[PDB]
Design an enzyme around this catalytic site. Structure first.
Site, PDB file in Angstrom:
ATOM      1  N   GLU A 141      19.717 -20.621  62.914  1.00 43.70           N
ATOM      2  CA  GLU A 141      20.627 -21.428  63.746  1.00 43.70           C
ATOM      3  C   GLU A 141      22.113 -21.348  63.365  1.00 43.70           C
ATOM      4  OE1 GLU A 141      18.976 -25.320  64.509  1.00 43.70           O
ATOM      5  OE2 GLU A 141      17.445 -24.186  65.628  1.00 43.70           O
ATOM      6  N   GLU A 250      10.803 -20.717  66.037  1.00 41.14           N
ATOM      7  CA  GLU A 250      10.327 -22.100  65.968  1.00 41.14           C
ATOM      8  C   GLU A 250      10.026 -22.655  67.353  1.00 41.14           C
ATOM      9  OE1 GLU A 250      12.862 -24.766  63.777  1.00 41.14           O
ATOM     10  OE2 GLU A 250      13.487 -23.241  62.301  1.00 41.14           O
TER      11      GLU A 250
HETATM   12  O1  LIG Z   1      16.501 -36.042  50.863  1.00 39.57           O
HETATM   13  C1  LIG Z   1      15.693 -36.919  50.149  1.00 39.57           C
HETATM   14  C2  LIG Z   1      14.717 -37.428  51.045  1.00 39.57           C
HETATM   15  O2  LIG Z   1      14.235 -36.298  51.909  1.00 39.57           O
HETATM   16  C3  LIG Z   1      13.120 -36.687  52.795  1.00 39.57           C
HETATM   17  O3  LIG Z   1      12.783 -35.526  53.520  1.00 39.57           O
HETATM   18  C4  LIG Z   1      13.472 -35.421  54.809  1.00 39.57           C
HETATM   19  C5  LIG Z   1      14.794 -34.755  54.707  1.00 39.57           C
HETATM   20  O4  LIG Z   1      15.736 -35.635  54.054  1.00 39.57           O
HETATM   21  C6  LIG Z   1      15.352 -34.355  56.043  1.00 39.57           C
HETATM   22  O5  LIG Z   1      16.604 -33.659  55.910  1.00 39.57           O
HETATM   23  C7  LIG Z   1      14.381 -33.482  56.776  1.00 39.57           C
HETATM   24  O6  LIG Z   1      14.875 -33.181  58.056  1.00 39.57           O
HETATM   25  C8  LIG Z   1      14.336 -31.896  58.560  1.00 39.57           C
HETATM   26  C9  LIG Z   1      13.212 -32.075  59.531  1.00 39.57           C
HETATM   27  O7  LIG Z   1      12.059 -32.732  58.920  1.00 39.57           O
HETATM   28  C10 LIG Z   1      12.782 -30.753  60.082  1.00 39.57           C
HETATM   29  O8  LIG Z   1      11.729 -30.902  61.061  1.00 39.57           O
HETATM   30  C11 LIG Z   1      13.948 -30.031  60.707  1.00 39.57           C
HETATM   31  O9  LIG Z   1      13.529 -28.761  61.166  1.00 39.57           O
HETATM   32  C12 LIG Z   1      14.586 -28.117  61.964  1.00 39.57           C
HETATM   33  C13 LIG Z   1      14.721 -26.728  61.522  1.00 39.57           C
HETATM   34  O10 LIG Z   1      14.954 -26.645  60.046  1.00 39.57           O
HETATM   35  C14 LIG Z   1      15.761 -26.000  62.300  1.00 39.57           C
HETATM   36  O11 LIG Z   1      15.767 -24.569  62.000  1.00 39.57           O
HETATM   37  C15 LIG Z   1      15.333 -26.157  63.734  1.00 39.57           C
HETATM   38  O12 LIG Z   1      15.901 -25.273  64.652  1.00 39.57           O
HETATM   39  O13 LIG Z   1      15.398 -27.537  64.155  1.00 39.57           O
HETATM   40  C16 LIG Z   1      14.257 -28.129  63.457  1.00 39.57           C
HETATM   41  C17 LIG Z   1      13.987 -29.480  64.064  1.00 39.57           C
HETATM   42  O14 LIG Z   1      15.202 -30.211  64.023  1.00 39.57           O
HETATM   43  O15 LIG Z   1      15.066 -29.847  59.750  1.00 39.57           O
HETATM   44  C18 LIG Z   1      15.492 -31.153  59.205  1.00 39.57           C
HETATM   45  C19 LIG Z   1      16.587 -30.934  58.193  1.00 39.57           C
HETATM   46  O16 LIG Z   1      17.754 -30.425  58.836  1.00 39.57           O
HETATM   47  O17 LIG Z   1      13.137 -34.237  56.945  1.00 39.57           O
HETATM   48  C20 LIG Z   1      12.535 -34.601  55.645  1.00 39.57           C
HETATM   49  C21 LIG Z   1      11.277 -35.369  55.864  1.00 39.57           C
HETATM   50  O18 LIG Z   1      11.581 -36.483  56.664  1.00 39.57           O
HETATM   51  C22 LIG Z   1      11.965 -37.185  52.003  1.00 39.57           C
HETATM   52  O19 LIG Z   1      10.840 -37.599  52.911  1.00 39.57           O
HETATM   53  C23 LIG Z   1      12.345 -38.293  51.159  1.00 39.57           C
HETATM   54  O20 LIG Z   1      11.195 -38.690  50.310  1.00 39.57           O
HETATM   55  C24 LIG Z   1      13.489 -37.961  50.266  1.00 39.57           C
HETATM   56  O21 LIG Z   1      13.891 -39.121  49.523  1.00 39.57           O
END
Ligand SMILES: OC[C@H]1O[C@@H](O[C@H]2[C@H](O)[C@@H](O)[C@H](O[C@H]3[C@H](O)[C@@H](O)[C@H](O[C@H]4[C@H](O)[C@@H](O)[C@H](O)O[C@@H]4CO)O[C@@H]3CO)O[C@@H]2CO)[C@H](O)[C@@H](O)[C@@H]1O
Length: 512
Positions: A141, A250
């Site tokens: 991206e 994706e």
């Molecule tokens: O940071 C400590 C905290 O983290 C928690 O985990 C979180 C992350 O903080 C959060 O950034 C993450 O967000 C992800 C998301 O889950 C993904 O589905 C998403 O995937 C993207 C993809 O990477 C892109 O290429 C694509 O095109 O879009 C998709 C969908 O948007 O990416 C984001 C990050 O940018 O989610 C994690 C889980 O919720 C922990 O759970 C927590 O315990 C920690 O304290």
């Protein structure tokens, strides 16, 4: 390698999300560092390829050489080797670096591009001698640069990879347009002059359905299905039938929970990708599909649908997938409609015991309408919840599983809450006995005006967004701190449930 060859070798794919791409390092987010046996589990499922997103950021050293940390490179190789040794086709990339530092390209191209080149030369050299089942994806991206800069970046990184020679001379390299977006690929992108490249985009439309935003809790109208096809057909017409292989890096739902819609969405999209010779790679962040700790799929049916559809095999889809029966209601025969998609119903089972056709159920001549008899339903059904499951088997494609769910009116211990604006700290818990019902969506309205609680964010709807605004956990309902902070005066929240039309109304009073 033709587009058809790539489809045959790679479809369907799966992403190791939120793992080596986490920030600052592997294990920083919701998944622990990946165990080797997780790749055995993905193999068991029947995926032919895996994508391994990697965020290099915190592991890159200082200018001028930007040396990548040795232990990190060793770890990325270890995980990549695990996948390759399971005969997967494997996609290795640069992931959240895209917004962590690569998006400085617009403002500081000469420094950023120099740095990215030095990073990619290091990755290319380490993995130079790996088999041809390993693919390189230049950047996830990409953002913060012009279309021209994007095309420059693709060309320069590809030249660096090619220049390392050996197997990198012919290795498949995956490129796309800005933000891995399909319209950028079609209108601003230009293919590098190289006959071993693969094109990519990501697909998450409609965003508000896949993410359950603004109350968009179902999918599957005739227009929606038509629009999905019209979205991706131009990529086939411009590129695939001109000989460019294509990877959908994706796709998938991101919190949508209604079964029927979810199953229909995945079958429809994966079949369309297969039809147009595009490799579909499923986004799994570790929370939404495969449970790595339990080593089980949270929705086994949708997984089986992807496996079959990704091999070009259509899946029958039943409606309803969840049958809700209210405690005390009169029971009558139940109709289940089947979108056969060319398949043939071979039986209906509970556990491994078959229902009797004629007395337990009947079918119309077309074989697409099943009547479960009232007497049979009565046997299957005093505690609320899933009481039984009927497995519809078909000669080909995935089986469909229908939950028979007993429910009753949901009960809340407390339906009115007072919040002090200066005392907000964390989410609001709303203890509940949902009695078999499930959370669907939530809306919030300001009492005095009738306008949306989140009017300053979304002016046109009172409906909130899954996860960022609300969630269900262990049978209780929650409003996120985010929502509480927008409250100005007394407001009413409506927690809309499954089955459709059941809801729980919660009033929230505001004090200083
Ligand atoms: O940071 C400590 C905290 O983290 C928690 O985990 C979180 C992350 O903080 C959060 O950034 C993450 O967000 C992800 C998301 O889950 C993904 O589905 C998403 O995937 C993207 C993809 O990477 C892109 O290429 C694509 O095109 O879009 C998709 C969908 O948007 O990416 C984001 C990050 O940018 O989610 C994690 C889980 O919720 C922990 O759970 C927590 O315990 C920690 O304290």
């Amino acid at each position: 390698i033709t587009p058809a060859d790539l489809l045959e070798n790679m479809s369907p794919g799966w992403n190791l999300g939120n793992t080596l791409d986490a920030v600052p390092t592997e294990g920083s987010w919701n998944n622990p560092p990946v165990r080797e046996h997780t790749f055995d589990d993905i193999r068991d499922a029947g995926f032919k390829s895996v994508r391994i997103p990697v965020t290099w950021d915190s592991h890159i050293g200082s200018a001028p050489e930007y040396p990548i940390d040795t232990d990190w490179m060793n770890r990325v190789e270890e995980v990549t080797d695990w996948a390759l040794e399971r005969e997967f086709y494997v996609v290795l990339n640069i992931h959240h670096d895209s917004w962590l530092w690569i998006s400085r390209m617009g403002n500081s191209q000469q420094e950023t591009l120099d740095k990215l080149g030095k990073v990619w030369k290091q990755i290319a050299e380490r993995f130079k001698n790996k088999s041809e089942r390993l693919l390189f994806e230049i950047v996830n991206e990409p953002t913060g640069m012009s279309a021209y800069q994007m095309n420059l970046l693709n060309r320069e990184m590809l030249n660096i990879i090619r220049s390392t020679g050996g197997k990198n001379g012919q290795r498949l390299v995956i490129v796309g347009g800005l933000e891995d977006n399909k319209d950028e690929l079609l209108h601003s992108f230009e293919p590098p002059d190289d006959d071993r490249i693969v094109l990519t985009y990501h697909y998450y439309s409609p965003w508000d359905y896949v993410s359950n935003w603004w109350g968009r809790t179902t999918w599957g109208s005739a227009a929606e299905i038509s629009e999905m096809e019209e979205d991706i057909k131009p990529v086939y017409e411009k590129f695939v039938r001109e000989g460019y292989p294509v990877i959908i890096g994706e796709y998938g739902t991101l919190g949508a929970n209604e079964k029927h819609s979810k199953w229909l969405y995945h079958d429809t999209f994966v079949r369309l990708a297969h039809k147009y010779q595009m490799v579909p790679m499923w986004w799994d962040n570790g929370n939404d599909q495969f449970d790595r700790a339990e080593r089980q799929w949270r929705d086994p049916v949708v997984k089986e649908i992807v496996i079959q559809a990704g091999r070009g095999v259509p899946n029958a889809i039943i409606k309803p997938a969840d049958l809700f029966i209210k405690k005390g209601q009169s029971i009558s025969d139940q109709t289940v409609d089947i979108q056969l998609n060319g398949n043939v119903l071979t039986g209906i089972y509970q556990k491994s015991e078959p229902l009797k056709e004629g007395s337990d159920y009947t079918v119309d001549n077309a074989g697409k309408t099943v009547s479960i008899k009232a007497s049979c339903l009565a046997k299957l059904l005093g505690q609320p919840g899933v009481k039984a499951q009927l497995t519809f088997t078909f000669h080909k494609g995935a089986s469909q599983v229908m939950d028979i769910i007993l429910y009753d009116d949901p009960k809340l211990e407390k339906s009115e809450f007072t919040i002090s604006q200066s005392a907000i700290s964390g989410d609001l818990k709303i203890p509940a006995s949902l009695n078999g019902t499930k959370l669907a969506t939530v809306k919030g309205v300001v009492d005095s005006t009738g306008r949306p609680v989140l009017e300053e964010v979304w002016s046109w709807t009172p409906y909130l967004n899954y996860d960022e605004d609300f969630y269900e956990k262990d049978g209780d309902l929650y409003l996120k701190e985010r929502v509480l902070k927008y409250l100005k005066s007394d407001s009413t929240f409506t927690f809309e449930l499954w089955p459709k039309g059941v809801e729980a109304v919660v009033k929230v009073k505001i004090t200083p």
